Amino acid sequence: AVPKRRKSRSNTRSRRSQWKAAKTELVGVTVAGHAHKVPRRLLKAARLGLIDFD
Amino acid sequence: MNRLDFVDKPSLRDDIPAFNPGDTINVHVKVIEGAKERLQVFKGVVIRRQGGGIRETFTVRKESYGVGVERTFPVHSPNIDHIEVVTRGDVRRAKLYYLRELRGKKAKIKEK
Amino acid sequence: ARKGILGTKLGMTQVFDESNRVVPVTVVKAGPNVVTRIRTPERDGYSAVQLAYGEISPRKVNKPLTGQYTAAGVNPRRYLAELRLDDSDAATEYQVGQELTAEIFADGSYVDVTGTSKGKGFAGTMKRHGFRGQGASHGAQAVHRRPGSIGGCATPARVFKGTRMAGRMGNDRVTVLNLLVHKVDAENGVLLIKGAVPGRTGGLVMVRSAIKR
Amino acid sequence: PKPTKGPRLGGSSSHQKAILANLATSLFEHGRITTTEPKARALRPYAEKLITHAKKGALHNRREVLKKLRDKDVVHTLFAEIGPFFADRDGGYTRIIKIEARKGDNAPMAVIELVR
Amino acid sequence: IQQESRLKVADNTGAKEILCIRVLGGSSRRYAGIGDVIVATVKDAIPGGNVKRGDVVKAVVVRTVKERRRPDGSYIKFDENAAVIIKPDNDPRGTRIFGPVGRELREKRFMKIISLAPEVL
RNA sequence: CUCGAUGUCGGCUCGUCGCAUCCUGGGGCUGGAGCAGGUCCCAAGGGUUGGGCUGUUCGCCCAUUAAAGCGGCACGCGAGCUGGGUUUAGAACGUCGUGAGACAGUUCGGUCUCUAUCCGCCGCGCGCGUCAGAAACUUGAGGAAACCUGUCCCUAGUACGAGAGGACCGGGACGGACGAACCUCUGGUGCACCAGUUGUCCCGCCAGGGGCACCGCUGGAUAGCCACGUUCGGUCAGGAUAACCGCUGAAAGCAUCUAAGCGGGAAACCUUCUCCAAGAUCAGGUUUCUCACCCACUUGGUGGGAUAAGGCCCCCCGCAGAACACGGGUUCAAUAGGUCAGACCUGGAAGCUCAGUAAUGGGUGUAGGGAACUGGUGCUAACCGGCCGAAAACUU
RNA sequence: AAAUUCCUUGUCGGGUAAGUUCCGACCUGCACGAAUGGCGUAACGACUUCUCAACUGUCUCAACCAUAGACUCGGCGAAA
RNA sequence: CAGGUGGUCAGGUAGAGCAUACCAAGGCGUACGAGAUAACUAUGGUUAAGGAACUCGGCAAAAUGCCCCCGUAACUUCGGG
Ligand SMILES: [Mg+2]
Ligand SMILES: [Mg+2]
Ligand SMILES: [Mg+2]
Ligand SMILES: [Mg+2]
Ligand SMILES: [Mg+2]
Ligand SMILES: [Mg+2]
Ligand SMILES: [Mg+2]
Ligand SMILES: [Mg+2]
Ligand SMILES: [Mg+2]
Ligand SMILES: [Mg+2]
Ligand SMILES: [Mg+2]
Ligand SMILES: [Mg+2]
Ligand SMILES: [Mg+2]
Ligand SMILES: [Mg+2]
Ligand SMILES: [Mg+2]
Ligand SMILES: [Mg+2]
Ligand SMILES: [Mg+2]
Ligand SMILES: [Mg+2]
Ligand SMILES: [Mg+2]
Ligand SMILES: [Mg+2]
Ligand SMILES: [Mg+2]
Ligand SMILES: [Mg+2]
Ligand SMILES: [Mg+2]
Ligand SMILES: [Mg+2]
Ligand SMILES: [Mg+2]
Ligand SMILES: [Mg+2]
Ligand SMILES: [Mg+2]
Ligand SMILES: [Mg+2]
Ligand SMILES: [Mg+2]
Ligand SMILES: [Mg+2]
Ligand SMILES: [Mg+2]
Ligand SMILES: [Mg+2]
Ligand SMILES: [Mg+2]
Ligand SMILES: [Mg+2]
Ligand SMILES: [Mg+2]
Ligand SMILES: [Mg+2]
Ligand SMILES: [Mg+2]
Ligand SMILES: [Mg+2]
Ligand SMILES: [Mg+2]
Ligand SMILES: [Mg+2]
Ligand SMILES: [Mg+2]
Ligand SMILES: [Mg+2]
Ligand SMILES: [Mg+2]
Ligand SMILES: [Mg+2]
Ligand SMILES: [Mg+2]
Ligand SMILES: [Mg+2]
Ligand SMILES: [Mg+2]
Ligand SMILES: [Mg+2]
Ligand SMILES: [Mg+2]
Ligand SMILES: [Mg+2]
Ligand SMILES: [Mg+2]
Ligand SMILES: [Mg+2]
Ligand SMILES: [Mg+2]
Ligand SMILES: [Mg+2]
Ligand SMILES: [Mg+2]
Ligand SMILES: [Mg+2]
Ligand SMILES: [Mg+2]
Ligand SMILES: [Mg+2]
Ligand SMILES: [Mg+2]
Ligand SMILES: [Mg+2]
Ligand SMILES: [Mg+2]
Ligand SMILES: [Mg+2]
Ligand SMILES: [Mg+2]
């Protein structure tokens, strides 16, 4: 099937606005005296030094 | 152990001899014909046990008049009056389904 | 008149009756229940009684629900459901805090068992509605399990509401009627009900004395 | 162990057998492996059972391990060091730690290693 | 046993093999077990016999390969499907039965066949 | 109307509606003794079989059945399927034509495209609302689904009838078709289970094993999913009625079911049974919990900030599942895994030893191996944590 | 009664429980016919047509398993 | 770019074989991945009892299948079949 008509601006924008990134939550970590923030699922790795903070 | 063992235990039977597939067995089955209640006998070879305690079943096979018959009974069924072991078999399987297409000598189980 | 109890489906097994006939039964642990609440027509507009079933750590119950239980003077339970009675209260036969055990039923009576049926996920028309499908050969092209037509033509230029299609199946509330109570084991709080019972093993079940009988 | 529910790793299951054996060999050789999170979660019980065989440590257990592993050096080291090291521990011989995903496909990564 | 199934005749009317035309017992009844009446046609007959190829008959199934559950939880199962050609009054047309039959004929009131059978299991 | 395209018969799948009713239900008349029937009136709740022949619709036949209804919806339905027929190009027969060719004459052959934008429909979420923020349990306006029927026995060989034959009304038993739930049984399946086995390669070799050959093949097979399996269901009773049958009774001193008035009366209708449902914007009810601050200001039913009750995200999972959602658990922990023990499947491991020339067999030993089901065990992971989240008044 | 026969599913026989197709005939050849050959014919045919044995998920009537998609996440990113 | 492209060489075990299976010498893992038991589509597998009842039509599938030894019909153009 092909689109019968081009969608209006409003109708295109309603569907286009729902494509968005989910934001992950960050918790504090103190490694080597310095404080950082990592996602909560990476706390063990951060404390063991397996996370590269660049 | 199972969750329903306490439900099942006052319904199990004793006096049931230990038999394995390949054994020849006499089964004495209660029969109702009108108001008579006699006792029939099924002699055959045990070909299968399907475990599970109270819900365990066994199958015996015999050839009656040029026709093979198989009866499957529940172990612990009260219609079974008793079970007698005639012969011990010597088999390499648990289900002996290959006997379903053997007749005569070829359908014979060893005696150990 | 209407008797009810809440319990858990423990699975099925088989027993032999006095006629030496095998009976497939479902073991329902109709555990003790507490009343915890009475609905009167004067205060609520209908007559019913709550029932509390199931053990749970008190730390697993939030403050509002804990307060509701404290109002009844009962330790919190996991489940809570109302048994609806006839439009006559009779203002009797139930006290808050009273215990209900399995022997409110008797051998040879009939019950209605309601539970939550097992989930089947997203199901096709062939499983969900028993469609036939098209053939497996003789030229059929990629339509073996597909539904076929879903409407007419220019009249009406639409699909009728309630047309049967694919979708989620299961997880419904299901009541099975006229189940025979084979045995009431008051020692273990267990009802042996002849037949099948909706839901998975371990799910919440409501058992009610049958009205059709 | 409990069979995989859903599609197997690396395509078929003949591939999953080899993947699990190779991962187990590398884990016992190095003590610590980085891989995708599903692979590590699938490896954990598989490796723990081999460690249990090594803890029992008879000839039958060694043959049963050699059924799955093909590296005789790793079999020897597992039966000489990893078994006796874990002789006093009742399960839980491995540990899984989640790591930052990788570029390219954003696959979640994890490290699996023996407890000490 | 359903329509188009072929059966072995378990009595001496002279037919050796019948083909099931209809399963009596109601509209659109699907299967027949032990003790069910069948409209059949003769496909093979012994030369010089009572019945003939192409005759339409009524028969009762006495043996079936598919196992049957009995009210006590037992099951019976034979090695072949067999039928007995009967008169309209549920009596056999032959004079003797070959092979064993099931107890279900007792409840389906085929007493003459029950009494003529070599063995009733 | 449509030629800058509205796909043409039959079958399949899925239906939906009408009633001019085929069965089941209710009646009047009968040239209705009874059983059976004929005809007309009411009635659309459900049901309305499988095959042979033909492309067929139609029709005929076979075997059943309570019955094998008639029609509409683009002669319903090809962005759902088929492509046998018709209706392209090849070829042949008969007939017509000098011929090229023609033929509601026949016969063999002959490409069925498309990633769904909108409405529609089936499911599932996110947001906001329901005058504070939340948690639990609920009522039911209003809907959806369901609705079939046979045989046998007693009444009773009675009523009826010369005989033949043979009941109504009531009461039981057993079925067929259909549907729902479930996995105890039977049966199917089984891609990390057990065993045997062929070819080849490898593990140094023997022994023991492994890779590959459709899971190599073969024999079994717990769990889950399932039907061929197991249970249950379509009920009892009310209400208003259809045709029809009345009671009382005038107009019209009689009569008349009707004009006043009151009854009986069916699978149709409404309650009753099952399911959905307060976005039912008239946004319901019964309860329980928090029940509290700070700053700025144009002093505002103002903007921010931080909390409570309570959630959410993250983490460990599920018989919950496309994502999402749902349910359980998070050390005060048996949630998943491991580990120990069972249940169950397979069927007698390895090594050693004895017997045999050997292939092989016996003992050690109901052995060894093993997933899903059950119970113990605090060994591994459920963390040293983030984001949201509570109130102008006023009138009687 | 045909690769030819409209009427037509002609009629009779066989085969099937039931056969507009099939085989053998009849002759009433709409409209057969002798080198645009007539009538036969062993062997041969990815030809057309009818019947049987065996076998089977074609079907009664479906169920389950694995893989590639579909579905989710990250990257690139069209079309009528 | 799953199509097309002439010639030469061409090992082992099994095998009649340059078929087929597994390997050697020698190459290669080839250019989106990672997950996840939805319907549905495709490609394979198994299926109780029945066995063409399917359908225009046994379409598709299933089945047969090898070496050796017996034995083998109508009809025939004497070769066959
Ligand atoms: Mg066993
Ligand atoms: Mg089908
Ligand atoms: Mg096609
Ligand atoms: Mg296609
Ligand atoms: Mg297909
Ligand atoms: Mg319209
Ligand atoms: Mg699985
Ligand atoms: Mg993939
Ligand atoms: Mg393989
Ligand atoms: Mg036009
Ligand atoms: Mg146009
Ligand atoms: Mg009418
Ligand atoms: Mg009448
Ligand atoms: Mg008369
Ligand atoms: Mg109707
Ligand atoms: Mg109604
Ligand atoms: Mg219609
Ligand atoms: Mg049409
Ligand atoms: Mg098309
Ligand atoms: Mg069409
Ligand atoms: Mg269309
Ligand atoms: Mg269209
Ligand atoms: Mg065509
Ligand atoms: Mg032409
Ligand atoms: Mg001419
Ligand atoms: Mg054609
Ligand atoms: Mg309502
Ligand atoms: Mg269902
Ligand atoms: Mg089970
Ligand atoms: Mg089974
Ligand atoms: Mg294995
Ligand atoms: Mg090998
Ligand atoms: Mg060797
Ligand atoms: Mg290899
Ligand atoms: Mg099973
Ligand atoms: Mg009157
Ligand atoms: Mg509404
Ligand atoms: Mg949760
Ligand atoms: Mg041994
Ligand atoms: Mg002629
Ligand atoms: Mg002609
Ligand atoms: Mg003709
Ligand atoms: Mg035929
Ligand atoms: Mg035909
Ligand atoms: Mg002819
Ligand atoms: Mg000519
Ligand atoms: Mg000429
Ligand atoms: Mg000729
Ligand atoms: Mg040729
Ligand atoms: Mg050809
Ligand atoms: Mg993407
Ligand atoms: Mg190329
Ligand atoms: Mg070679
Ligand atoms: Mg090759
Ligand atoms: Mg290879
Ligand atoms: Mg998915
Ligand atoms: Mg089959
Ligand atoms: Mg079979
Ligand atoms: Mg055939
Ligand atoms: Mg047919
Ligand atoms: Mg048909
Ligand atoms: Mg073919
Ligand atoms: Mg094949």
Side-chain angles (χ1 to χ4, degrees):
Chain A
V2 298
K4 184 90 172 149
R5 295 176 175 91
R6 70 182 276 175
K7 300 190 67 69
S8 61
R9 299 176 55 92
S10 175
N11 271 311
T12 300
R13 268 139 182 87
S14 298
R15 186 212 51 247
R16 185 158 291 161
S17 86
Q18 290 304 88
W19 182 72
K20 54 215 199 183
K23 201 161 78 46
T24 185
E25 294 294 328
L26 301 175
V27 306
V29 176
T30 306
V31 57
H34 296 285
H36 304 272
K37 323 199 74 63
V38 301
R40 189 183 148 84
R41 64 196 304 275
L42 302 187
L43 266 171
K44 291 177 71 68
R47 305 225 173 71
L48 311 191
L50 306 162
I51 294 303
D52 208 355
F53 299 96
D54 281 340
Chain B
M1 65 184 73
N2 294 123
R3 181 175 271 127
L4 301 176
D5 279 328
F6 70 100
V7 174
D8 298 323
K9 67 182 291 294
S11 179
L12 303 159
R13 288 187 75 189
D14 291 331
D15 296 330
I16 292 170
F19 60 91
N20 294 343
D23 298 1
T24 294
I25 280 287
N26 268 311
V27 181
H28 299 255
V29 190
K30 297 164 187 175
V31 169
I32 301 299
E33 307 170 73
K36 295 311 288 174
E37 164 50 50
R38 59 177 278 264
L39 195 66
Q40 211 188 329
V41 171
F42 196 92
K43 190 182 154 303
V45 172
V46 171
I47 73 178
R48 155 171 81 178
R49 292 272 290 255
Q50 279 180 331
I54 188 56
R55 65 192 65 78
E56 183 177 357
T57 61
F58 76 100
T59 295
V60 287
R61 181 175 172 81
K62 76 174 277 192
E63 192 145 357
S64 181
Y65 287 78
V67 192
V69 188
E70 293 180 355
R71 293 293 307 280
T72 300
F73 304 95
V75 184
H76 317 291
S77 178
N79 296 114
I80 288 165
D81 189 358
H82 60 287
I83 294 180
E84 183 178 1
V85 180
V86 192
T87 307
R88 310 289 186 173
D90 186 74
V91 297
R92 308 290 305 279
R93 307 300 165 90
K95 289 292 186 282
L96 295 204
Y97 291 142
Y98 63 95
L99 293 188
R100 288 181 175 172
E101 52 202 336
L102 294 165
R103 318 262 173 272
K105 323 302 199 63
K106 296 183 290 294
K108 182 62 65 68
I109 297 89
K110 281 177 68 178
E111 190 276 331
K112 190 57 63 180
Chain C
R2 189 72 154 160
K3 291 181 292 275
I5 200 72
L6 276 166
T8 295
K9 186 182 167 174
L10 292 198
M12 309 183 49
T13 179
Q14 60 179 37
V15 297
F16 310 96
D17 80 355
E18 293 82 3
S19 296
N20 286 0
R21 285 186 317 230
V22 70
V23 182
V25 292
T26 306
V27 180
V28 175
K29 191 186 63 180
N33 294 15
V34 190
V35 159
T36 301
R37 189 57 174 241
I38 297 169
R39 311 289 206 183
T40 60
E42 190 276 331
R43 169 194 297 276
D44 308 65
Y46 67 106
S47 182
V49 55
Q50 276 188 351
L51 297 174
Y53 167 72
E55 294 294 328
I56 187 173
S57 296
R59 57 145 200 271
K60 284 187 189 163
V61 194
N62 51 22
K63 279 176 65 49
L65 198 47
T66 306
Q68 300 206 83
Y69 275 106
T70 298
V74 181
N75 299 44
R77 300 307 201 282
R78 178 163 292 277
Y79 301 112
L80 205 59
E82 274 176 38
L83 171 67
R84 178 80 170 268
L85 314 164
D86 61 348
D87 268 353
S88 179
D89 194 337
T92 44
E93 69 274 15
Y94 285 108
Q95 297 294 321
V96 167
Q98 186 216 321
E99 294 293 328
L100 296 190
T101 59
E103 69 275 16
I104 62 170
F105 300 105
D107 291 331
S109 66
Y110 301 93
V111 286
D112 292 333
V113 187
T114 176
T116 299
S117 64
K118 304 173 87 152
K120 309 302 199 299
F122 200 106
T125 53
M126 269 193 100
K127 190 198 280 313
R128 196 187 177 205
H129 297 304
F131 281 17
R132 293 180 179 91
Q134 292 82 17
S137 192
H138 294 280
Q141 172 170 207
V143 285
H144 311 294
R145 304 184 64 94
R146 274 173 73 189
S149 182
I150 66 169
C153 198
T155 293
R158 60 186 182 108
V159 188
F160 286 133
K161 189 177 291 295
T163 295
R164 300 194 295 170
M165 284 151 164
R168 276 268 280 275
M169 180 185 178
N171 304 273
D172 305 318
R173 169 191 180 79
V174 165
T175 309
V176 185
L177 303 174
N178 297 329
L179 294 189
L180 166 73
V181 181
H182 180 75
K183 190 210 188 65
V184 173
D185 175 354
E187 182 65 26
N188 316 269
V190 161
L191 296 176
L192 298 196
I193 296 150
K194 173 203 187 187
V197 164
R200 62 170 153 92
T201 296
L204 183 69
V205 162
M206 179 69 150
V207 177
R208 288 183 311 197
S209 81
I211 61 171
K212 307 184 160 183
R213 299 273 172 90
Chain D
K2 186 174 175 66
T4 296
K5 168 179 73 192
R8 312 304 192 274
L9 301 165
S12 52
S13 50
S14 46
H15 195 178
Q16 197 190 242
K17 296 183 319 177
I19 282 179
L20 284 176
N22 281 322
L23 280 186
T25 290
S26 296
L27 166 69
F28 294 144
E29 187 185 305
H30 294 99
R32 165 177 270 204
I33 301 299
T34 311
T35 185
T36 72
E37 183 178 1
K39 279 186 216 303
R41 292 192 187 279
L43 178 65
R44 187 152 73 110
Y46 183 94
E48 289 187 304
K49 296 203 173 291
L50 296 182
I51 296 181
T52 296
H53 274 94
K55 278 186 51 164
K56 284 150 151 62
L59 177 59
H60 187 248
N61 300 117
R62 198 191 277 255
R63 300 278 179 88
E64 183 66 26
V65 159
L66 279 163
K67 257 174 188 179
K68 303 211 158 70
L69 299 190
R70 271 180 269 196
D71 192 312
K72 268 151 168 265
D73 291 331
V74 187
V75 167
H76 157 81
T77 187
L78 169 83
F79 268 71
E81 295 178 354
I82 309 181
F85 181 78
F86 285 125
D88 67 30
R89 191 183 277 270
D90 285 23
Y93 314 111
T94 54
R95 162 196 285 126
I96 292 181
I97 299 139
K98 294 175 281 286
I99 301 299
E100 175 191 8
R102 73 195 186 182
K103 300 179 184 181
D105 44 45
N106 199 49
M109 311 279 315
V111 304
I112 188 167
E113 86 269 15
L114 317 168
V115 169
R116 275 92 65 88
Chain E
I1 293 303
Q2 46 179 267
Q3 179 198 318
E4 297 272 298
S5 295
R6 282 161 181 255
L7 294 174
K8 182 175 174 66
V9 162
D11 60 309
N12 61 351
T13 60
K16 293 187 286 185
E17 183 178 1
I18 53 159
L19 187 153
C20 174
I21 288 181
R22 183 58 56 209
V23 178
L24 308 176
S27 316
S28 43
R29 179 154 167 175
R30 199 144 288 132
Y31 312 88
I34 292 170
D36 291 331
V37 182
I38 289 301
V39 166
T41 181
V42 181
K43 309 307 290 203
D44 196 340
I46 193 66
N50 201 29
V51 298
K52 300 294 183 182
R53 263 162 75 251
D55 275 340
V56 174
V57 297
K58 283 222 204 310
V60 55
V61 189
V62 300
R63 292 203 281 285
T64 187
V65 177
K66 189 62 173 170
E67 67 283 359
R68 295 292 300 274
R69 181 175 158 113
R70 296 186 167 192
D72 63 358
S74 48
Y75 298 78
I76 189 169
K77 160 178 206 311
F78 303 87
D79 269 6
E80 65 183 1
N81 313 277
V84 167
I85 299 178
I86 55 166
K87 288 182 217 133
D89 68 294
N90 288 0
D91 274 25
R93 283 180 59 184
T95 61
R96 52 199 285 257
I97 314 294
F98 306 115
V101 301
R103 297 272 173 210
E104 293 82 3
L105 307 157
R106 174 65 67 88
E107 286 56 65
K108 287 310 190 264
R109 68 181 65 252
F110 283 98
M111 309 307 300
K112 181 69 176 177
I113 295 167
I114 288 298
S115 68
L116 289 175
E119 173 184 41
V120 190
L121 301 165

